């Protein structure tokens, strides 16, 4: 006759969620510079990131309902303002601006303006007459010479992230406390849904740069064997679809203009870092990508789509549809500055079944509302000189078209813009559970009288 | 053996009763955005002292093993000794127990320590 018997510390866990915590290691912590991007209070990473494998455990993984993303989504926004609050508020910068088409010899059909405006000084009585050079996307005109005003003036209070704090993405390892853990799904071909064959537990993730970017993923994790195709539901065109490379892709992003930073005193303790006149040749931002590995990438990809869609079909690439500039173009911070690039010729293709490189135009925008939250904007101070950043492309986000013509051709374009998809890139293999160390199972045992 | 944290999971219970002091040891492990690392370990000592409280108020008061004067009712997951420990794992078994745990637990708290620890003062009052 069986009884009940209690066992403490049994390998029984249940699925739950709680608050996690960052690990930036120690090396990007030394970047300092008065709170470079994230790392300030961040906990160090484990020197030996112990990864323990569990056997005979069939665990069902979902990256799309994974809660660790929404946390990472909010922290980056809060940490963003945590920089801007001690930083310089640019709310007084909303002013009538007398600007001119920038100095060049014709051959246009500008976008840079020599902007003279009446400003204020640290001494509250006396005022300031200054000039600065602004990109066309941060201002708008108002209706003698044309007058201009900032774009955020009628929307949200503008601040400026002080030049000490940087935007540079720093690898972050999210960790879990006791009574909980993190599970890493290591199986090579894994679509992110359903059960996960390879289940291993860790207390912290790998290095994850919270890259603030759109249309392209940089510096992240690479896939294995075939390039993996992951989507929550592929029958819905609206749901975004994420990909992971087995081969990293090189890109060289540059701002070729040699900038000057004019620091003007709005204080005491306040001040504004303006843009000075370009020194020498007038060029424009751009990034280069190899066309050869690119063409082969689309060939290795199109062979992987023909497992899920058709054995032999047609695949066409076309440029984007419409939306905010943060979607329709590629956003990211290159070292101090936020670039917005035209992506067209990458996606000029039509594929069916069976030496040089490329180049893309780019634009820089300083005032940024990113994550769209109104009432508070931010201004990115200009960085002195030629900016260069090299990135490695580990991931993608795409959407599909619509019924069109029956079993004819499917078209694909860029997509996303919700940064929750950015964090799904490194979190696809992760999820959280909770331990139930108490258990009751029968046996012939019985306690005393 | 040292299978680490949760390493004896998909094995059956009769062999998986060896990482009990492994998982029992790794249960406790001992201005904004400094708050992110402070709230998390609060539930560790609460989850620990809940287990210690239930282990105390059940008739066991000691770690990792216990026995009971509570019968294994035939309304509770009727399996043989191989079919409990040797055929079913901890998740597989506790899955089956997930209905009737409280009907066990009231007998654990109430028929034991409200009874047999009441008997300790009655048998020791001489």
């Amino acid at each position: 006759n069986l009884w009940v018997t209690v066992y403490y510390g049994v390998p029984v866990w249940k699925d739950a969620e709680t608050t996690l915590f960052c690990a930036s290691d120690a090396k990007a912590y030394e970047t300092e510079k008065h709170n470079v991007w994230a790392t300030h209070a961040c906990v160090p990473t484990d020197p030996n990131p112990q990864e323990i494998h569990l056997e005979n455990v069939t665990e069902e993984f979902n990256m799309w309902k994974n809660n660790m993303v929404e946390q990472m989504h909010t922290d980056i926004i809060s940490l963003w303002d945590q920089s801007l609050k001690p930083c310089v508020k640019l709310t007084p910068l909303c002013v009538t601006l007398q600007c001119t088409n920038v100095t060049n010899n014709i051959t246009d059909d500008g976008e840079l303006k020599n902007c003279s405006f009446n400003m204020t000084t640290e001494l509250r009585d006396k005022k300031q007459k200054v000039y600065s050079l602004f990109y066309r996307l941060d201002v708008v005109q108002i209706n003698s010479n044309k007058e201009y005003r900032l774009i955020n003036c009628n929307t949200s209070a503008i601040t400026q992230a002080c030049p000490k704090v940087s935007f540079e993405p720093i690898p972050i390892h999210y960790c879990a406390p006791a009574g909980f853990a993190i599970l890493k799904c290591k199986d090579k071909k894994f679509n992110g849904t359903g059960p996960c064959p390879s289940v291993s537990t860790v207390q912290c993730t790998h290095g994850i740069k919270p890259v603030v970017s759109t249309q392209l993923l940089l510096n992240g994790s690479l896939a294995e064997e075939e390039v993996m195709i992951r989507s929550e539901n592929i029958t819905n065109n609206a749901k975004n679809i994420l990909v992971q490379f087995n081969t990293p892709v090189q890109i060289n992003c540059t701002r070729p203009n040699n900038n000057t930073r004019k620091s003007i005193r709005i204080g005491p303790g306040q001040a504004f870092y303006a843009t000075g006149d370009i020194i020498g040749d007038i060029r424009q931002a751009h990034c280069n990508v190899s066309k050869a590995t690119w063409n082969e990438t689309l060939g290795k990809v199109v062979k992987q789509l023909r497992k899920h869609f058709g054995n032999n079909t047609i695949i066409r690439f076309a440029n984007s549809s419409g939306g905010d500039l943060e979607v329709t173009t590629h956003s990211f911070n290159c070292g101090g500055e936020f670039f917005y690039c035209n992506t067209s010729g990458l996606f000029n293709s039509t594929w069916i079944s069976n030496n040089d490189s490329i180049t893309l135009p780019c634009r820089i925008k300083q005032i940024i509302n990113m994550w769209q939250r109104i009432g508070q904007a931010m201004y990115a101070p200009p960085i002195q000189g030629v900016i260069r950043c090299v990135s490695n492309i580990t991931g993608l986000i795409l959407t599909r078209d619509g019924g069109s013509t029956n079993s004819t051709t499917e078209t694909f374009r860029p997509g996303g813009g919700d940064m929750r998809d950015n964090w799904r890139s490194e979190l696809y293999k992760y999820k959280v559970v909770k331990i139930e160390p108490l258990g009751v199972a029968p046996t012939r045992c019985k306690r005393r009288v | 053996v040292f299978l680490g944290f949760l390493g004896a999971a998909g094995s059956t219970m009769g062999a998986a009763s060896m990482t009990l002091t492994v998982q029992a040891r790794n249960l406790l492990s001992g201005t904004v955005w400094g708050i992110k690392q402070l709230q998390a370990r609060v539930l560790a000592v609460e989850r620990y002292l809940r287990d210690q409280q239930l282990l105390g108020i059940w008739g066991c008061s000691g770690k990792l093993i216990c026995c009971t004067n509570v019968p294994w009712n035939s309304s509770w997951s009727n399996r043989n000794l191989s079919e409990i420990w040797d055929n079913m794992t901890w998740l597989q078994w506790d899955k089956e127990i997930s209905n009737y745990t409280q009907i066990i637990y009231g007998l654990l708290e109430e028929s034991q320590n409200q009874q047999e620890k009441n008997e300790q003062d009655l048998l020791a009052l001489d």
Partner: antibody, heavy 132, light 109 residues
Framework: QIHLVQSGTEVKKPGSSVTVSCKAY?????????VNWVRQAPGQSLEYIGQ??????????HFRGRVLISAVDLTGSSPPISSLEIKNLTSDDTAVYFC??????????????????????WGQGTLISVSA | DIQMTQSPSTLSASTGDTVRISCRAS???????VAWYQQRPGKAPRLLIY???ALLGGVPSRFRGSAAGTDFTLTIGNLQAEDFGTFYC?????????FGQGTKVEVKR
């Protein structure tokens, strides 16, 4: 919402075979849902035939080797669907044939018990009439 | 295979009544792996109760199940017009899942 649409009625002779389709609209995937085929004889009870869970096909011992149950995940065009094929028909197989969709995501759901499960979503049904 | 013997085969009731359908099993099912279904003629069955007394999302509170040893009982207090039909009990403790003979629920006259 989940809607299971199966094929149209079929009349067939003994010794022949037949496959019935089961459109599973609303199901995200057969990796988080299992498909059970159940037969209802005329004016009698229901009978379990087989299922497909974790992409593992199954037979009743009564129907062992006589039946085949296949399913495929959604085409880009269409949602994932299961198919029930029956061979060596007899007049004793004349019945209505049901498609079943049951969520398999939660181990504790109580809908399922190590492959043996209840049936949460059903289809209209396919009438198979066997006569010479 | 488990054999489910349902009882009664037919019962009569009227709106608002409290009605009871019993279903006994050949073996004892401790895990309470028994379900309840309603089938109006022609239309497909609807899952009403699983695991003994678990209510499926959207099933009225008027339906409630009780499981004790071998015997099972589905209870319908406040019987409605929409409720009339035939009912079946299903076990899934052992493979294969098996159903009951069925209980017709007719109106009174």
């Amino acid at each position: 919402q989940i809607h299971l649409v199966q094929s149209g009625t079929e009349v067939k002779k003994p010794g022949s075979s037949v496959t019935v389709s089961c459109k599973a609209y609303g199901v995200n995937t057969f990796g988080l849902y299992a498909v059970n085929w159940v037969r209802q004889a005329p004016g009698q009870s229901l009978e379990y035939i087989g299922q497909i869970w974790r992409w593992k096909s199954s037979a009743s011992h009564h129907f062992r080797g006589r039946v085949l149950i296949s399913a495929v995940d959604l085409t880009g065009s269409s949602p994932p669907i299961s198919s029930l094929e029956i061979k060596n028909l007899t007049s004793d197989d004349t019945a209505v044939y049901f498609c079943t969709t049951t969520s398999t995501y939660d181990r504790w759901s109580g809908l399922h018990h190590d492959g043996v499960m209840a049936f949460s979503s059903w289809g209209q049904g396919t009438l198979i009439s066997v006569s010479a | 295979d488990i054999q489910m013997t349902q009882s009664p085969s037919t019962l009569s009731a009227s709106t608002g009544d409290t009605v009871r359908i019993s279903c006994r099993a050949s073996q004892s099912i401790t895990g309470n792996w028994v379900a309840w279904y309603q089938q109006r003629p022609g239309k497909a069955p609807r899952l009403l109760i699983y695991r003994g007394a678990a209510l499926l999302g959207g099933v009225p509170s008027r339906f409630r199940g009780s499981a004790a040893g071998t015997d099972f009982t589905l209870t319908i207090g406040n019987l409605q017009a929409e409720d009339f039909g035939t009912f079946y009990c299903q076990q899934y403790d052992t493979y294969p899942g098996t159903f009951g003979q069925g209980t017709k629920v007719e109106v009174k006259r």
